[PDB]
Structure 1
């Protein structure tokens, strides 16, 4: 075993950082950059494939984790959500060509973050 919780929180933090450039663009605070968008989408898709291996049943009582017990009661659903994110991100990479398509396609990707957090992450801090 190892400190899997530190592992996952780090990768998940990277996903949040990855969405920043995109949110800046939506908020009109940054000029649309296709290279930056694709870089963030690729990062998100790659991390989504690494995360399914980082949620072992013995990592629910750390004291510094926001992962809810339900993850282990609905593990098939939880894993698939990461799969849905990866698939959505990879698809987005191919459909997002300009600012108009970013605004139009980014929701399907980012909607996954909320879907999981609603059921599997503790509201707090």
Structure 2
């Protein structure tokens, strides 16, 4: 869907921005600094689930650019492993949110965050 590689970069940056907001806005709730409304979080995590499936298709072949390291393309199977693993951690977070289980939510949220941090150290430029 991208006319030029630059369009893919702008799409993925925007998808990751949104994904990041929908994940990060739950930090005060996980820490107990904001109230836990199970329905609010269930709906939020549904949005996060949709958004979390979007960036990866905008790292197609030849879409080098942005703050992306070149290792995303040469190590196709390893990058793919990390996105699919991240998405599976999102499934766990969805299950916790759907259950309205705060403890399960907190644990899953930490696992998701670790997946974010790992793909970052590996596949994002300084």
Q: Same fold by TM (over 0.5)?
A: yes
Moved more, 5-14 or 48-57: 48-57
Deviations 1:54-103 (A, max 9, x none): 11232224xxx110001112111112222112221122221342332222
Count how many residue pairs are aligned between Structure 1 and Structure 2: 120
Separation in structure 2 between the aligned mates of residue 99 and residue 70 of structure 1, nearest angstrom: 37
Provide closer, same or farther for how the CA distance between residues 40 and 86 of structure 1 changes in structure 2, counting only shifts above 3 A.
Answer: farther
Maintained 8 Å contact 1:51/1:82:
no
Q: Are 2:107 and 1:104 equivalent residues in the alignment?
A: yes
Separation in structure 1 between the aligned mates of residue 10 and residue 38 of structure 2, nearest angstrom: 32
Match of 1:4 among 5, 8, 13: 8
Provide closer, same or farther for how the CA distance between residues 80 and 53 of structure 1 changes in structure 2, counting only shifts above 3 A.
Answer: same
Runs of 4+ in 1 over 3 A off after TM superposition: none
Provide closer, same or farther for how the CA distance between residues 83 and 23 of structure 1 changes in structure 2, counting only shifts above 3 A.
Answer: same
Question: What's the CA shift for 1:51?
Answer: 2.2
Secondary structure at the aligned position of 1:6 is classed as helix
Q: Are 2:106 and 1:114 equivalent residues in the alignment?
A: no
Separation in structure 2 between the aligned mates of residue 68 and residue 45 of structure 1, nearest angstrom: 25
Provide closer, same or farther for how the CA distance between residues 116 and 55 of structure 1 changes in structure 2, counting only shifts above 3 A.
Answer: same
CA RMSD of aligned residues (A): 1.9
TM-score if structure 1 supplies the norm length? Answer: 0.82
Separation in structure 2 between the aligned mates of residue 27 and residue 94 of structure 1, nearest angstrom: 19
TM-score if structure 2 supplies the norm length? Answer: 0.81
Structure 2 runs not aligned, ≥5 long: none
